[PDB]
Design a binder for this molecule. Structure first.
Ligand SMILES: [Zn+2]
Length: 125
């Protein structure tokens, strides 16, 4: 089986907040990584890629997998490189479904967007 995992990366220009909104800017050149544990409780399948002009990455995956998620690794904007931890204390990752065990036929799986965060608050934040 082949898949592509597709998602977006932005710069959140509101350092005071942790979200993607109308002030958010699509980021080219960001680096992301797919990691799947495949129920072995350690990462055993991993794939990296970069976002394009629209801030979209598209990772080609071979095989079905479980316990998969996408994390930000590197920013291409030194002014926008925080990875905001959630109030829970954990880093946010985008989950993806690459399970054989469903009736989903699409070969592209889309994921929720991620953002790096600026150090300042833009006007209107
Ligand atoms: Zn599992």
């Amino acid at each position: 089986a082949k898949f592509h995992v597709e998602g977006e990366v932005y710069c959140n220009v509101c350092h005071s907040r942790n979200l993607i909104n109308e002030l958010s800017e699509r980021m080219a050149g960001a680096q992301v990584q797919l990691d799947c544990k495949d129920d072995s409780k350690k990462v055993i399948y991993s794939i990296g890629g970069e976002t394009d002009q629209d801030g979209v990455y598209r990772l080609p995956v071979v095989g079905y997998h479980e316990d998969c998620e996408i994390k930000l690794v590197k920013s291409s904007r030194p002014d926008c490189s925080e990875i905001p931890k959630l109030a829970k204390g954990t880093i946010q990752t985008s989950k993806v479904d690459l399970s054989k065990n469903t009736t989903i036929t699409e070969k592209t799986r889309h994921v929720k967007p991620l953002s790096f965060r600026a150090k300042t608050d833009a006007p209107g934040c």
